[PDB]
């Protein structure tokens with residue numbers, strides 16, 4: 182078996198190998214990359230997502246989210262308080278202000294220490310889940326707006342045509358902005374490109390060990406656990422690397438820098454934080470190996486997790502037994 186210790190692998194495709202997305206994902210998996218739950222792909226040196234980022238300031242963040250923490254430094258939840266709309270220009274100015282800017286630090290490790298020590302005492306503002314793309318329409322390789330759709334994948338594998346579309350989202354981050362522990366909707370893959378700015382640190386649990394993370398989460402967030410049998414779908418719980426180590430949860434960490442792709446694999450729990458002002462783009466995707474994960478994905482039916490139009494069809498076709506109850510939560 183390749184990559185038996187489930188280490189995060191880093192890939193360096195040639196421009197030639199960068200031409201066929203599906204084939205390269207399949208190549209990564211042949212080398213065991215999926216075992217980690219997360220891989221990094223450094224694009225060929227000749228590749229660019231677009232010519233410049235000079236004209237992005239007028240993108241609107243219609244609902245910036247202030248991420249308010251509760252709990253203890255290593256074990257907390259976060260809630261999103263909706264803020265008034267602002268442009269990316271305004272947001273970047275806010276990110277750079279004395280109140281929100283990245284503190285002085287030695288290196289990524291020092292900044293990670295300061296994150297876990299101090300996150301809970303600040304409420305950074307996250308421009309998340311903004312439908313759109315920063316890829317130039319003339320970028321032909323690994324253009325997150327031109328991937329094949331999950332609906333087409335299901336049709337090709339399963340022969341059923343379904344409604345739904347699949348489009349990317351932009352994330353504008355600042356220091357301490359945080360993504361809670363989660364897998365993707367329907368345990369899909371995700372791909373994330375860091376277009377610009379400061380890094381993003383990721384933590385990930387190997388898919389083969391996800392249930393160990395879930396078990397610890399139920400012990401650490403016991404009221405959440407009683408409220409819903411899949412509360413990590415709410416995307417609100419944080420658990421520090423220290424706490425995961427204390428409880429013997431296998432995980433890995435890696436820092437993504439501007440110009441790099443990350444791929445999360447089905448049922449790879451991940452969480453992380455942004456180092457400073459940045460802009461990422463991400464989209465879910467599927468492969469034939471995903472199908473079985475989609476069939477087994479947990480679902481939130483308590484009504485908190487409230488997800489996209491397109492997830493309906495996935496649950497309807499892959500999880501017909503769940504469908505009724507899950508849709509009661511959706512409506």
Ligand SMILES: O=C(O)CNC(=O)C(=O)O
Nearest residue numbers: 352360371372373461463
């Ligand atoms: O970048 C973020 O804030 C969160 N991104 C992801 O969870 C992802 O790409 O799967």
Ligand SMILES: [Mg+2]
Nearest residue numbers: 236237239240
């Ligand atoms: Mg603009």
Ligand code: NI
Nearest residue numbers: 364365371451
């Ligand atoms: Ni994710």
Ligand SMILES: [Zn+2]
Nearest residue numbers: 409481483485
């Ligand atoms: Zn729920």
